[model samples]
Target: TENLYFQSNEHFLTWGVFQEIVPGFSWIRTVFRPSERPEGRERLAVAQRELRRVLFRAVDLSAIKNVMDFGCGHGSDLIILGEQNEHLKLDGYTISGKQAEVCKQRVRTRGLQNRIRIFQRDSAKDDFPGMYDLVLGFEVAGLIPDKDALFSNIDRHLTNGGLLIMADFVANTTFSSTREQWNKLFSSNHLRLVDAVDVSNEVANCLHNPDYAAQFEALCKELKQRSFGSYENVYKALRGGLISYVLFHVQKDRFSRSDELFHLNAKQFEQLTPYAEFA
Candidate 1:
């Protein structure tokens, strides 16, 4: 009911168990491709590295000085990004206090206290501190109920011309309808779509990793008293093909109307398919 899935330390410990059993686990929630066509634990690492590349490309890292990461689970992405841009200032938000504590400890160990900060807050409902030239969230949008409200808060904290990058899962539906809904909501909130990449095929493969299967089996056996409803929710969502992963790169454009001409790059057109005509 609380929507705080990792609220307990025990729940986090489960992931530590996951890491030990699954070789090369990177502590990132979202996974992508395996290195070789034939793979096991290496597959998730491959996907994570690829996903990081796409995320890094989504924004102009050279131009941004300050950035925020919403739902920054376990600080993996934050630490990676911080290491890439040593001059960059970072703030991370998360709903789980335990996750925040873990992230803080990691930050301290990395000796990046001057460059990175982590806070615990329900980003969907809370106001964030300071404005940033770039904002990002990886695999977090599905947890949000009202994206419009989420962007409204972002709008307040994002500098003009700032970019907002997100990697998320969207329900499978008519492309036109989904694009329209996205355009309407973003236009009204002062964000304009720059580009989006369909990474659904890549993200879906994470669910198929045999290592995940074995680790989860171990987890179920270890925590037999706990219901697997939460686990089943994600398994079904992927197995049913009801969702797909996407990379959204949007910029602050407070004056654009919904029907205004917007540039859609070739890659986006190729990915968006029929909806490319409207974009």
Candidate 2:
């Protein structure tokens, strides 16, 4: 629940696990969490580098000139992408106005005004005026419930043969017992688990339909960094840490949804994720 809340506030929630995923990825871990332990910072920078490699390779960035980062958090990833690929231009849309302010500030600080920009907009409803070489939403796809409408809307704005790459949280819905146990855990944490099985099933079909690999591999690895004090602390930091989220990059087809605008309202957006029930 804390993880969800932190993510809502645009904080880096999973940096602790990055060290285990990649080498030399820790460089920016300190940028976000400067007061954290140096050992943790080193691990995070390595993991970030690895994450960048995996994400960039997933999109095949060399050929893409224009990009849209949906649900971009404070535009950190956009700034990093601009630095990595000097030729590419990026536009990011997000739901949080406060986060958008921070993102603008970050862009100003980094002097990336020309190459990268951010706006506070809702992905469920906002329109992309122009074509983009690539549209990527990292880790935010799961929060949306209407998978069909979501995918269809994504296809509407993408250029012909443009790619929509989403790195998100998903589950496999085959285990009813596991799902029940997971719900029990969330209930204990004073939150509700909405559409866990449905989300897993929907995303499973989406990932499987794409010609992409049956099983995805992370070029960057991940390992647990430190132990938390209790189940509350650990569980607070994770969605019980039992379920898994996967990634998929799919090409757009003919499908499009017109009623996409109403799906997102202020209340719906805020309550989509709940905060710490137990800690």
Best by TM-score: 1
C-alpha local distance difference test of each model: 0.61, 0.48
Give the alpha carbon lDDT tens digit for every residue of 145-182 in model 2: 44445454565667756766544443323221233332
Candidate 2 residue runs with Cα over 4 Å from true position? 1-6, 9-36, 174-242, 253-279
| Tens digits of lDDT, candidate 1, 1-279 | 211122221011111111112433322222222242434444445556666566556576888899888788888777876887898999989988888999999988888889999999877788777899988876665567777777788888998888988765555553212554566556666777677656544443343333466776665575444444354454455456565456677788765554552333222433542111322
Task: Predict model 2's lDDT versus the native.
Answer: 0.48
Worst 10 residues of 2 by lDDT: 202-211
Which 10-residue window in model 1 sums to the lowest lDDT? 10-19
Off by over 4 Å in 1: 1-42, 174-177, 209-241, 258-279
Clash count for each candidate, listed in order shown: 3, 18
Clash list (residue pairs), candidate 1? 32-47, 33-47, 34-43
Could you estimate the TM-score for every candidate? 0.71, 0.57
